[PDB]
Every structure is written in structure tokens, then in C-alpha cells.
């Protein structure tokens, strides 16, 4: 089915940085246009990096100029050798005909370009980005460029996970008055909700099989029974003793640490008291 | 405080004594916390009495 | 790996510290849930898609 | 019973020391009745009422000495020692008759509860 | 409602740091506060995007050594960096020389960024050390001498790709240097008196935070099976030891540091209680079903 | 799988050949869940006739455990050693399904065994067949199972399955609710502190405005 | 110099033998080393006093107990240090003025 | 006497937590009055 798209957690950060930069510079958020670069291996397409392309406006329409891309194409060839043009990204919602018009000269530059959509105004659990492939229609007349939606993967190299965890541990939670609770108790809440959704789907399938909407597949129900019988995990005495020991240890570690915040407030109080009601 | 041992006079045997680090750690921390609370309340009473000019004339 | 207690004549090979076993069991349960969901999705893709779409709303 | 509602209807809050506390602690000590004074001795005094004048240190010392004796009578030494210690370390410039019988008993209480006479702060 | 605050368009000071106050930058440059005292900026804050770009450049270098620039600004006592930009330099894994290619590359890339809409300037440079820790060598010390003495706002960055890959944590090291004349541990090298170290911090925007949290959301199994405080025990013990040393130093000083010690203790206690809370939540969710 | 390989031959045949085929299935290694074999109409038609004993044996293998082959030992035909070993393995799987720490005495009573070494060898061979995964412990006389395959399910127990899943769902929902409440409270607390601080600031600067006269 | 020998080899054999044990019998070591009980006890005492063998001798039951215990409870000691420091800081704050 | 895994000791630690938190709250309330005192703005 067409080509397999390999998306990396580096293009998205570039788009977000560009969007926030323009939003802060102009005050009123505007549309941003860039590019996508990577590798073509047979029927597989992978995206490595992304650099912005200058775009001009004429009347009300947007035009991608060729000279700036020509000058910038050989510039980054020095650092990245086996890197070639793939497509471009932009910010927006649904595919408007302006997208088709702007994609016309992209198809002129490269026969079959890819398309990336990032929607900062998303209110859904799905990935805000979307990958589209260009299709040329055969019907006579105005041959509109058709966007075929494909599947995007999350292929990553060795250093991606460690970097994202390192940056996401802090997130400057203690400077924006966002409360560390509102981060910790919320980050895993989404995972718990996802597990709830999966269990609900399994229960719905089991109920449908019981009623008779779906055929009696006498293989999935065995796995469902096995999953059912494995719910009370590790109800032994050793686990309970270890858990209680852990709880007591964390309680003591919190006591040593509350006892010093109280002491610091104590010190500040005596420092302020030694100036107001007592001379020197 | 040179030898950590216990004497059993029934069989006349000197046993070695092993200290449970977790238990003594918890006991010391609890004792320190109680002492600090007592000292804090004492000083706060002092601040209450040193602000009203109580000096036993 | 392991150690021998000669008094009781018992060889100990491997021991589990409870909490790592708990983590492993939780991971196994999650993997089982994922595999079951994949199996039902493969068996009846259209019904699974319809149920998912109904649950999105 | 009079100096329970007298105290309750005079202090701004329950953590305020008034001159009647030293009076109830003496009334309930001269006659052997220790339990009624317990609610007013289990709280930690936090502020002292100025009483728009008066309130010499005699009331404060009498309260913190009679409370110590009351606690000693009920065999609660870990707080009788604290009460006597608070009574002793009051600022003073001359010898008073009530601090003598608060150090004398302080030594005995420290010898009972602990193995030594505690060093004064 | 479930997330309470959410975000349509509102932001806070986290998103405010991404801007360019021309008058403020001009007046801090003209005033030159750091030219009067040696013990100026000690806090360096670098954005995520620059970090990943540096890491990918170092990895693409392989066993050899790479080298590139960085972009940002200075704000009061702190330094801000938010862009990485690689260079086409080659050489043996023990020495790299910037030929004319890099000289024609940095200017061209700066002009291209200015055409794009970028407004920041060169702030420093990053060099990858393949294996031999993170410490400035003699030639690095001389280069930093000349750079910080000619181009006063500057900072060097040294990372270790091999150790970062093997261990699992990054080896970012931000260094400024004491100028010549001011004279007033074998890991740091032999010129430990000439150069010193700085602390590192990171930031990300509201949009970046939302995107990172939503991307990391596809990690639920590890999220609810990690069981932290059992993997970072050594880190917490080291933190408590440093807490004890800082507390001793503060007590000696009292005879401020007490505020810093209180903040560090609060951070460690918050981490410990967060681990306990996650463990309790997991126990409630999994071990309290089907009797 | 093995059941698929042994299932296509059971369509055309009926009678003695069919019972021989089911005996071969019960003897063949690897087969441990007889769900589709029993679901066929040819197998179910054996109830009427002289082959009801084989149907009862198949039902006992599919759902019952070893003691069920105690009261009616004389009714069913003779079993070979392979069938007995398979039945013992199924009984072990059924026992491990309920509790995750099987005592040795319970296994000895359930499997009708006389020697501890023979029981340990049977458990070892069951683990080798890879139907359950676990480890033995002689000091506590325990067998710990980390994962056991689910056995056959009849078309009347499914409702019970639903119940358990429902319970799990409810629990998850409860946790979610608590989460929200907690975080809300936390946020409020933080806000309150900030607010009061701001108020104090206003007060003091107001004092400044009235003291610099 | 033959007395220095017939003792280093015995020490090496003893170290190599008691590695996987946690509670060993002294007569077993005597049988392995081809010496009587008294010499085995003297050798064990000398080795332990030199901080070479991590273990202790139970004279009542004639046993040697190794040191396959005492896990890494360094956390605890760190906490102890913290407690001590906290106590000191307490004396600084309460007794500042009042 | 006792190994520190009984939940009763957890309850005792929680009680000590509550007492310390209340003490710090009273300290902060006492300090806030000083911070707004008309005397403590002249120095």
C-alpha cells in the first residue's frame, strides 16, 4: 500500500518551535510553511530533519519560491550527505484548496511529494499530525490533487527515548506555578484511561459474543478467561510486608524534610522577630 | 562500650550482639522529632512572654 | 549462581524480591491485554473499528 | 466550676494565657481535684493577654508552678519536667519565693524521669 | 474539566522567555554588567530542540569527533540557548580543525536564518569528546581564552557521545572560564584552576510540553509498570548525602544557604512521595480486584 | 495447529473410527484444549448409542479434573499412561488457575500420588511441555506459577467472565474519579497560598504609599 | 622456610572452599584440609583477625558462619547523618535570641 | 519491642506529620502579622 512512512520525534519539535516563535513575534498566530527531508529506500520513506522554506504571498495566495530552496539545498548537503527532498509541512486543520494550490508547485519541484499536517488547535486523543500522499486524478477538467491518508510510525534511534525522558522529567514545573501534583497525577491518568478503554473494548466484544452479534470464536474467549483469572496479582504476605516497609520508609523520609522546612520557617520568624519587638 | 556482646549465665556463654540498623535509625529519628517539637513550643512560649515585658520586677 | 547451607543441607539457586516480581506480573498482564486486543482486531476488523468509532463519541 | 466559664468567656482564643489560669490551678490544687484542670493544661499557651495593665509575673509563675505540681501528682513526669523548666527560665532580676520551689522540685522530677539532673538551657 | 486548566491560547512565563526584547538586549549589552566582576553568570538554560540536535550530530559523527555552533541570548544573570546548528568539519577522533568550509558555513547559515526570521546571534560552540569524559583540553582552554576575551558573551559546551549512549544519561557540560590573572579533582583535568563548571537547566514551551506529553503517552505499560524509587535508589542516596553536606555548611554559616538546602530537601521529599503515590495507585488499581 | 490437523478427518467418519480418532487426539501430545473438537455435531451425536462413555470421557478432559475420574472410574474405558499424564497436567493447570501458590499437600491429595519425587517429576515434565510457567520451592513445599494457560470454557460461564471484567472497569473508573478530586484540591491549595502572598504584598506597599510623606 | 609453606596452600584451599557456603561445619574443613580440629580453628581465627575471611566462628556448635548478609542499607546511614545535622541546626535556631 | 512495618507506626508518623504541619502553620500566621506591622517597615 503506497509507501511506509517513518516519522521521527524531531520534525514535530521543529514545527512547534517555529509556531511558538512566530506566535510570540507577531502576537497573532499565523500559518507557517516548511519542508521535510529524509531517505527513500524502495517502498519505504523515512523523515530525518526539516528546515523552513521561505514563502511569498501574492494578493491572497501563497507561493513557494524556487531560488531560495535551490540555494539552501546545496548548503545542508555538506553536513547531511544521503538526505533528499520528500515534502513539506504546514499548520492548519482540514485540507483547504489553498493546500492544493501550494502543493501544485511542490509537485512541480518533486514528482510525488509527501504532506504533513500539524494542528495546534486539536481537541482529540489522536496524533495532531497526518501524512498525505499526492494522487493525480484522471477525470477530465480541473484535475485536483487528491490526498491519500497513510499510516505514520514512531521509528526512533537509540537516543530518542532517553532525551525525551530527560526533558520531560522537569518541564519547568516549579517555575510556572503549575503544581507538581497537576503534572504527576495527570501524566499517568491518561495511561490509566487508555487501559480502561482497552478493557472496555474487550468487555464489549465478550458481551457481543455472548449475545450473538459476532460468531462464536472459541479461541479468544479462552484468552479472556485466562486474563480474567490473573487479576489478583501477588496477594502473598511477603509482598504486603515489603509494601508496608516501603510505605514506612517513605514516611520517615518525608518526616525528615518536613522537619527542616518547619525549621527554616522557624529561623525566618526569629530573624524577623529580632528586629521588630527587640532592638538589635 | 568496647565489646557489643551479651552474657548468658545459664550456660555461661558470651553471645555477639548485632544491631538492627533500621530500627535504631527509626528510633533516633522519632526521638529527634519529639525533641524538636518540644524545643519549638518552648521557644514560642518564650517569644510570647518576652514580648509583653515580663521580667519579675 | 546460588549458595549452599550445609546445616540444613539446602542449595538455594534463585530468589525473587517480591516487588520486581510484581512489576514483571503487571507487565505480563499489560502485554496479554495488548495481544488480546490485537487478536480481536485481526479477527473482526470491521466490528472492532465500529466499536472504536462508537466509543470515540 | 466558676473559673471554667470565667476563663472560657474572657480569653480571645483557647491558646491565650489569662490571669485566672493561675487561680483555677490553685483552687483545684489546694483541694484535691486534678481532672477538671486537665483540659486547660493539655493546651500549649501561645499568647498572653495584656489585660490592659496589671498581670505581673507572679500569675505566670504561679500558673506554671501549680500546673507542674498537678502533673507530678498524676504521675505524668515527662510534662511536669517541662512545666518546671518553663517556670525556672523566666527572666528575673531578684530572688523570688516561687522559683525556689520550682528548681527544688525540678531536680527531683528530672532524677525520677531521667537518670540525671538535666542541664538548664 | 478533567484537566481543569487545559489550554486554548493562555500561557505563562514559561512561554514568555521565547521573545526578543530589542531595547532590553541593547541596554544590557551597553551596560555590560558581567565585565565588572569575574563571578557572573552561573545559570545556563538550553532548550530541548538544541539538545536533541546536538545529540543526533554527535551520534552521526560516530567514533570520530564533530563540532558545531549554538544560538541564543543572555538575560540578566542567566544565559538562554535555544538553537543548535551543526558544521561540516572532519578529522581524527582526537583532533578537529575548522577549515574554510566551516568559515563559509556559519556566515551562510546565519544569513539564511536571518532571511527566515531568526533574530538570535552566536552564543557559543559544542564539541564532542568520544570517550574521554567532559573536560576542556589545552587547545580548548586557549580557544576559550581568546573567545571569551574578544567576544565577552560566550560559553563552551562539551558532551561525551559514547558514555551518554552506554550509560543512558546525557553528558551535557556547559563551561565558562576565568580570565587570565585571577588565580583563586583529577577528572576535570590539569587546568582545573583556569576553567570552571556551570549548572545546566532546560525549558520547553506550552505547545512543546503538550506535544511531548501526548507523544510520550504511548508508553503506558512502562508508565504504570516502572515502579520508580527502586531504580533511582543510588541517585536518592547521593542526593541525601549532598543534603547532609549542605546542611552542615549552612549550620557552619549560621555560626542564604539555608534556603537552598530547604529547596533541595523539598525536591527530594516531593520525588519520594511521588514514587510512593504511584506505588499506592498501582496497588489500588491492580491488587484490589477479584478479591 | 494440532487440533486443526486432527479436525478435518472427523467430518466424514462416524462410529468406531470417530471414537478411535478422539482417542488418538486425547493421546497426541501438544493438544490440551478440546474446544472445537467437542463443538462438532458428530461428537455431540454420540450421546445416543453405545459410545456415550467416550463422550463423557471427552467432557471430563475438556472441563473436569482428576477427582472427577474417581467416582466414575469403572464407567469409562481403560486409559493409557499418556492419557493419564495429560489428565494430571490438566488438573495441575486447573488448580494453578485459581491460586498462584499451590501447596505440595494439596497437589498430592488431588493427583492421588504417593511419593514427593514422582510429583516433582510430573510437575517438571508439565513445565517442560510448556503449559504452565513457574518454580518449585522445597523449603516451603510450594509451587509458584507466574502464568498458566486458560482451560476450556463452556457456553454458560461467559456471563461470569463479563462480571469480572465489569468489576475491573468499575474500579478503574473509581480511581479516575479520585485522581480528579485530588489534583483539583492540590491546585486550589497552591492558588490560595499565592493569593494570600499577593494580598500581603499589596498591604505592605500600601503602607509604603502612606509612610513616604 | 617449609613452615611458611604448607600454610599458604592451606589458606588458599580454605578460601577457595568456603566461597559458596553460608554455614559450614568445622570438622568438614578439617577433613578437607587433612588437619585436626584445633589447627583448623587456629587457622580460621588467624585468617579472620587479618581481615581476609569475611565470617565468624560459633564455638558452641563448632560452626563457621559466612557473611552472605548485610545488604546495601547505606540509605539508612545517610538518613542518620541527616538527622544529626538537623539536630545541630535546631540548636542554632531556638537559642538564637529567644 | 517492634519492627517498623506495622501500620500503627505509620499512623504514629502521620500524627507527627499533622502536629508539625500545624506548628508550621501557626508559625507562618505569627510571622505574617510581623511582616505587616507598621513598625517593621522603617528598618
Q: What is the 3-state secondary structure of C36-50?
A: HHHHHHHHCHHHHHH
Number of CB atoms found within 10 A of residue E42's CB:
13
Q: Which of B35, B16, B32, B36 is nearest to B24 (CA)?
A: B32
CA atoms within 13 A on the CB side of A244: 15
Which residue of C19, C27, C34 is in closest CB contact with E230? C19
Q: Buried b / exposed e across B7-17, counting CB within 10 Å, b at 16+? A: eeeeeeeeeee
Please work out, in degrees rounded to the nearest 5, the angle formed at the alpha carbon of residue D65 by the alpha carbons of D61 and D68: 145
Tell me whether residues A196 and F173 touch, CB distance under 8 A.
yes
Tell me whether residues B35 and G94 touch, CB distance under 8 A.
no
Number of CB atoms found within 10 A of residue E135's CB:
21
Q: What is the CA radius of gyration of chain A?
A: 28
Q: For chain G, how far is it from start to end, CA to CA, in angstroms?
A: 75
Q: How far apart are CA F165 and CA A69, in angstroms?
A: 57
Tell me whether residues H20 and B30 touch, CB distance under 8 A.
no
Chain G contacts of A266, Cβ < 8 Å? Answer: 93-94
Assign D95 to helix, strand or coil: coil
Q: Which of A223, A229, A232, A233 to mutate to test the interface with F (most CBs of F within 10 A)?
A: A229
Task: Tell me the residues of A at the F interface, defined by beta carbons under 8 Å apart.
Answer: 177, 179, 181-182, 185-186, 189, 192-193, 195-196, 199-200, 202-203, 206-207, 209-210, 216, 218-219, 221-231, 234-236
Backbone region of residue G72 per phi and psi (left: phi > 0; alpha: psi in -120 to 50; beta: other values): beta
Task: Report how far Cα D100 is from the mean position of its chain's Cα atoms.
Answer: 15
Q: Which of E191, E100, E105 is nearest to E143 (CA)?
A: E191
- DSSP state string for A219-263: THHHHHHHHHTT-S---SHHHHHHHHHHHHHHHHHHHHHHHHHHH
Task: Tell me if chain D has a CB within 8 Å of the CB of B45.
Answer: yes
Q: How far apart are CA A149 and CA A131, in angstroms?
A: 6
Chain H contacts of B33, Cβ < 8 Å? Answer: 16, 20
Burial class of E36 by CB neighbour count within 10 A (0 to 12, 13 to 18, 19+): exposed
Is residue F122 within 8 A of residue F104, CB to CB? The reply is no
Resolution (A): 3.5
Q: Which of B47, B48, B56, B57 to mutate to test the interface with D (most CBs of D within 10 A)?
A: B56
Assign E155 to helix, strand or coil: strand
Which H or E run contains E47?
Answer: strand E43-47
Q: How far apart are CA D74 and CA D37, in angstroms?
A: 12
Tell me whether residues G21 and C7 touch, CB distance under 8 A.
no
According to DSSP, the β-strands at B13-16 and B5-8 are: antiparallel
Q: How many CB pairs under 8 A join C and E?
A: 20
Phi, psi dihedral angles at E214 (to 5 degrees)? -75, -30
> Which residues, other chains included, contact A6 with Cβ-Cβ below 8 Å and sequence gap of 6+?
A38, A44, A45, A46, A47, A153, A155
Name the residue of chain A whose CA is nearest to E2's CA.
Answer: A186
Task: Tell me if chain B has a CB within 8 Å of the CB of H28.
Answer: no
Residues 42-81 of G with CB under 8 A from A: 79
Tell me whether residues F147 and A196 touch, CB distance under 8 A.
no
β-partners of residue C12 are: C3
According to DSSP, the β-strands at A44-49 and A4-6 are: parallel
Q: How far apart are CA A121 and CA A162, in angstroms?
A: 28
Residues 30-89 of A with CB under 8 A from B: none
Which H or E run contains E242?
Answer: helix E233-254
Query: F43 vs chain C: nearest CA distance in angstroms?
Result: 26
Q: How far apart are CA A201 and CA C52, in angstroms?
A: 8
Tell me whether residues F167 and E290 touch, CB distance under 8 A.
yes
Number of CB atoms found within 10 A of residue H18's CB:
10
CA distances (Å), origin F10, targets A182, F5, F61: 62, 10, 18
The full length of chain E comes to 291
According to DSSP, the β-strands at E121-128 and E67-75 are: antiparallel
The full length of chain F comes to 213
User: What does the DSSP 8-state code read for residue D120?
Assistant: P
Is residue A88 within 8 A of residue A104, CB to CB? The reply is no
Is residue F166 within 8 A of residue A203, CB to CB? The reply is yes
Strands (E), chain A: 4-6, 36-41, 44-49, 55-58, 61-64, 84-91, 114-118, 130-136, 145-149, 152-153
β-partners of residue A114 are: A87, A133
| Maximum Cα interatomic distance, chain B, rounded to a whole number of Å | 67
According to DSSP, the β-strands at D47-48 and E43-47 are: unpaired
Which residue of G86, G90, G97 is in closest CB contact with A270? G97
Q: Which of B26, B48, B55 to mutate to test the interface with A (most CBs of A within 10 A)?
A: B26
Task: Tell me if chain C has a CB within 8 Å of the CB of F139.
Answer: yes
Which residue of B23, B37, B40 is in closest CB contact with H3? B23
Query: A31 vs chain F: nearest CA distance in angstroms?
Result: 34
Q: How far apart are CA E94 and CA E102, in angstroms?
A: 19
Query: E5 vs chain C: nearest CA distance in angstroms?
Result: 22
Is residue B38 within 8 A of residue D38, CB to CB? The reply is no
Is residue E198 within 8 A of residue E176, CB to CB? The reply is yes
Chain B contacts of A255, Cβ < 8 Å? Answer: 29, 33
Is residue B34 within 8 A of residue A255, CB to CB? The reply is no
Amino acid at each position: 500500500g503506497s509507501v511506509s512512512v517513518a516519522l521521527h520525534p524531531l520534525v514535530i519539535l521543529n514545527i512547534s518551535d517555529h509556531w511558538i516563535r512566530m506566535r510570540s513575534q507577531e502576537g497573532r498566530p499565523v500559518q507557517v510553511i516548511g519542508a521535510l527531508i529524509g531517505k527513500q529506500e524502495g517502498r519505504n520513506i523515512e523523515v530525518m530533519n526539516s528546515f523552513e522554506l521561505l514563502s511569498h504571498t501574492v494578493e491572497e495566495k501563497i507561493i513557494i519560491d524556487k531560488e531560495y530552496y535551490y540555494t539552501k539545498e546545496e548548503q545542508f548537503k555538506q553536513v547531511f550527505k544521503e538526505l533528499e527532498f520528500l515534502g513539506w509541512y504546514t499548520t492548519g486543520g482540514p485540507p483547504d484548496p489553498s493546500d492544493i494550490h501550494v502543493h501544485k508547485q511542490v509537485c512541480e519541484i518533486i514528482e510525488s511529494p509527501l504532506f504533513l499536517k500539524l494542528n495546534p488547535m486539536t481537541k482529540h486523543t489522536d496524533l495532531p499530525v497526518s501524512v498525505f500522499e499526492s494522487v493525480i486524478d484522471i477525470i477530465n477538467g480541473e484535475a485536483t490533487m487528491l490526498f491519500a491518508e497513510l499510516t505514520y510510525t514512531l521509528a526512533t534511534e537509540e537516543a530518542e527515548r532517553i532525551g525525551v525522558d530527560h526533558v520531560a522529567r522537569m518541564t519547568a514545573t516549579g517555575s510556572g506555578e503549575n503544581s507538581t501534583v497537576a503534572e504527576h497525577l495527570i501524566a499517568q491518568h491518561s495511561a490509566i484511561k487508555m487501559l480502561h478503554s482497552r478493557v472496555k473494548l474487550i468487555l464489549e466484544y465478550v458481551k457481543a459474543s455472548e449475545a450473538g452479534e459476532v460468531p462464536f470464536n472459541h479461541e479468544i474467549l479462552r484468552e479472556a478467561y485466562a486474563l480474567c483469572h490473573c487479576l489478583p496479582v501477588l496477594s502473598t504476605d511477603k509482598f504486603k510486608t515489603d509494601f508496608y516497609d516501603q510505605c514506612n520508609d517513605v514516611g520517615l523520609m518525608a518526616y525528615l524534610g518536613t522537619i527542616t522546612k518547619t525549621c527554616n520557617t522557624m529561623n525566618q520568624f526569629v530573624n524577623k522577630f529580632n528586629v521588630l519587638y527587640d532592638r538589635q | 562500650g568496647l565489646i557489643s556482646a551479651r552474657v548468658d549465665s545459664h550456660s555461661k556463654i558470651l553471645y555477639a550482639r548485632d544491631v538492627d540498623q533500621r530500627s535504631t535509625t527509626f528510633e533516633k529519628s522519632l526521638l529527634m522529632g519529639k525533641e524538636f517539637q518540644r524545643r519549638a513550643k518552648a521557644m514560642m512560649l518564650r517569644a510570647a512572654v518576652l514580648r509583653n515585658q515580663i521580667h519579675v520586677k | 549462581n546460588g549458595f549452599i547451607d550445609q546445616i540444613d543441607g539446602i542449595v538455594h539457586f534463585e530468589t525473587r524480591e517480591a516487588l520486581p516480581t510484581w512489576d514483571k506480573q503487571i507487565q505480563s498482564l499489560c502485554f496479554q491485554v495488548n495481544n488480546l486486543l490485537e487478536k480481536i482486531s485481526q479477527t473482526a476488523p470491521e466490528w472492532t473499528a465500529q466499536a472504536m468509532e462508537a466509543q470515540m463519541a | 466550676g466558676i473559673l471554667k466559664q470565667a476563663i472560657d468567656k474572657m480569653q480571645m482564643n483557647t491558646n491565650q494565657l489569662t490571669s485566672i489560669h493561675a487561680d483555677l490551678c490553685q483552687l483545684c490544687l489546694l483541694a484535691k481535684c486534678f481532672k477538671p484542670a486537665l483540659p486547660y493544661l493539655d493546651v500549649d499557651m501561645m499568647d498572653i493577654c495584656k489585660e490592659n495593665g496589671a498581670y505581673d509575673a507572679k500569675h505566670f509563675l504561679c500558673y506554671y508552678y501549680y500546673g507542674g505540681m498537678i502533673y507530678t501528682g498524676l504521675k505524668n513526669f515527662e510534662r511536669a519536667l517541662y512545666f518546671y523548666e518553663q517556670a525556672i527560665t523566666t527572666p528575673a532580676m531578684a530572688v523570688s519565693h516561687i522559683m525556689l520551689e520550682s528548681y527544688k522540685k525540678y531536680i527531683l522530677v528530672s532524677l525520677i524521669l531521667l537518670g540525671k539532673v538535666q542541664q538548664l538551657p | 474539566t478533567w484537566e481543569l486548566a487545559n489550554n486554548m491560547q493562555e500561557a505563562q512565563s514559561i512561554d514568555e522567555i521565547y521573545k526578543y526584547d530589542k531595547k532590553q538586549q541593547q541596554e544590557i549589552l551597553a551596560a555590560k554588567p558581567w565585565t565588572k566582576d569575574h563571578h557572573y553568570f552561573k545559570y545556563c538554560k538550553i532548550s530541548a530542540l538544541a539538545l536533541l540536535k546536538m545529540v543526533m550530530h554527535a551520534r552521526s559523527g560516530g567514533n570520530l569527533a564533530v563540532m558545531g555552533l549554538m544560538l541564543g541570548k543572555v538575560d540578566g544573570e542567566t544565559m538562554i540557548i535555544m538553537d543548535s546548528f551543526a558544521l561540516p568539519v572532519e578529522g581524527t577522533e582526537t583532533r578537529v580543525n575548522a577549515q574554510a568550509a566551516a568559515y563559509e558555513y556559519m556566515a551562510a547559515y546565519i544569513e539564511n536564518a536571518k532571511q527566515v526570521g531568526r533574530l538570535e546571534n552566536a552564543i557559543g560552540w559544542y564539541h564532542s569528546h568520544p570517550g574521554y569524559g567532559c573536560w576542556l583540553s589545552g587547545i580548548n582552554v586557549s580557544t576559550q581564552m581568546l573567545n571569551q576575551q574578544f567576544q565577552e558573551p560566550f560559553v563552551a559546551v562539551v558532551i561525551d557521545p559514547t558514555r551518554t549512549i552506554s550509560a543512558g544519561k546525557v553528558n551535557l557540560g556547559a563551561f565558562r572560564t576565568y580570565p587570565k590573572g585571577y588565580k583563586p579533582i583529577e577528572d576535570f583535568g590539569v587546568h582545573c584552576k583556569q576553567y570552571y563548571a556551570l549548572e545546566v537547566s532546560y525549558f520547553k514551551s506550552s505547545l512543546d510540553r503538550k506535544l511531548l506529553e501526548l507523544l510520550w503517552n504511548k508508553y503506558w505499560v512502562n508508565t504504570l509498570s516502572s515502579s520508580s524509587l527502586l531504580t533511582n535508589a543510588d541517585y536518592t542516596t547521593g542526593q541525601v548525602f549532598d543534603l547532609s553536606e549542605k546542611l552542615e555548611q549552612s549550620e557552619a554559616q549560621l555560626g542564604d544557604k539555608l534556603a537552598k538546602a530547604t529547596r533541595d530537601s523539598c525536591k527530594t521529599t516531593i520525588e519520594a512521595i511521588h514514587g510512593l503515590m504511584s506505588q499506592v495507585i498501582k496497588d489500588k488499581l491492580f491488587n484490589q480486584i477479584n478479591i | 495447529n494440532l487440533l486443526e490437523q486432527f479436525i478435518l478427518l472427523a467430518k466424514g467418519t462416524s462410529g468406531s473410527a470417530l471414537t478411535a480418532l478422539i482417542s488418538q487426539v486425547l493421546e497426541a501430545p501438544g493438544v490440551y484444549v478440546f474446544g472445537e473438537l467437542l463443538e462438532l455435531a458428530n461428537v455431540q451425536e454420540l450421546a445416543e448409542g453405545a459410545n456415550a462413555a467416550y463422550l463423557q470421557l471427552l467432557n471430563l478432559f475438556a472441563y473436569g479434573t482428576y477427582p472427577d475420574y474417581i467416582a466414575n472410574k469403572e464407567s469409562l474405558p481403560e486409559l493409557s499412561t499418556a492419557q493419564q499424564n495429560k489428565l494430571k497436567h490438566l488438573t495441575i493447570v486447573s488448580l494453578a488457575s485459581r491460586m498462584k501458590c499451590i501447596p505440595y499437600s494439596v497437589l498430592l491429595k488431588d493427583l492421588e500420588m504417593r511419593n514427593l519425587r514422582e510429583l516433582e517429576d510430573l510437575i517438571i515434565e508439565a513445565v517442560y511441555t510448556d503449559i504452565i510457567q513457574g518454580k518449585l520451592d522445597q523449603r516451603n513445599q510450594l509451587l509458584e506459577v507466574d502464568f498458566c494457560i486458560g482451560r476450556d470454557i463452556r457456553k454458560k460461564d461467559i456471563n461470569n467472565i463479563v462480571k469480572t471484567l465489569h468489576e475491573w472497569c468499575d474500579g478503574c473508573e473509581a480511581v479516575l474519579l479520585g485522581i480528579e478530586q485530588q489534583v483539583l484540591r492540590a491546585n486550589q491549595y497552591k492558588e490560595n497560598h499565592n493569593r494570600t502572598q499577593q494580598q500581603v504584598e499589596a498591604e505592605v506597599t500600601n503602607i509604603k504609599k502612606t509612610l513616604k510623606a | 622456610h617449609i613452615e611458611e609453606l604448607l600454610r599458604n596452600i592451606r589458606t588458599q584451599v580454605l578460601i577457595k572452599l568456603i566461597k559458596p557456603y553460608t554455614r559450614i561445619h568445622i570438622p568438614f574443613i578439617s577433613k578437607e584440609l587433612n588437619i585436626d580440629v584445633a589447627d583448623v580453628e587456629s587457622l580460621l581465627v588467624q585468617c579472620i583477625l587479618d581481615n581476609t575471611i569475611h565470617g565468624r566462628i560459633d564455638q558452641v556448635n563448632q560452626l563457621l558462619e559466612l557473611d552472605h548478609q548485610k545488604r546495601g542499607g547505606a540509605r539508612y546511614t545517610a538518613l542518620d547523618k541527616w538527622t544529626n545535622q538537623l539536630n545541630s541546626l535546631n540548636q542554632a535556631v531556638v537559642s538564637k535570641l529567644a | 519491642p517492634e519492627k517498623y512495618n506495622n501500620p500503627a507506626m505509620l499512623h504514629n508518623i502521620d500524627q507527627e506529620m499533622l502536629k508539625c504541619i500545624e506548628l508550621d502553620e501557626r508559625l507562618k500566621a505569627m510571622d505574617q502579622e510581623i511582616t505587616v506591622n507598621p513598625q517593621f517597615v522603617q528598618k
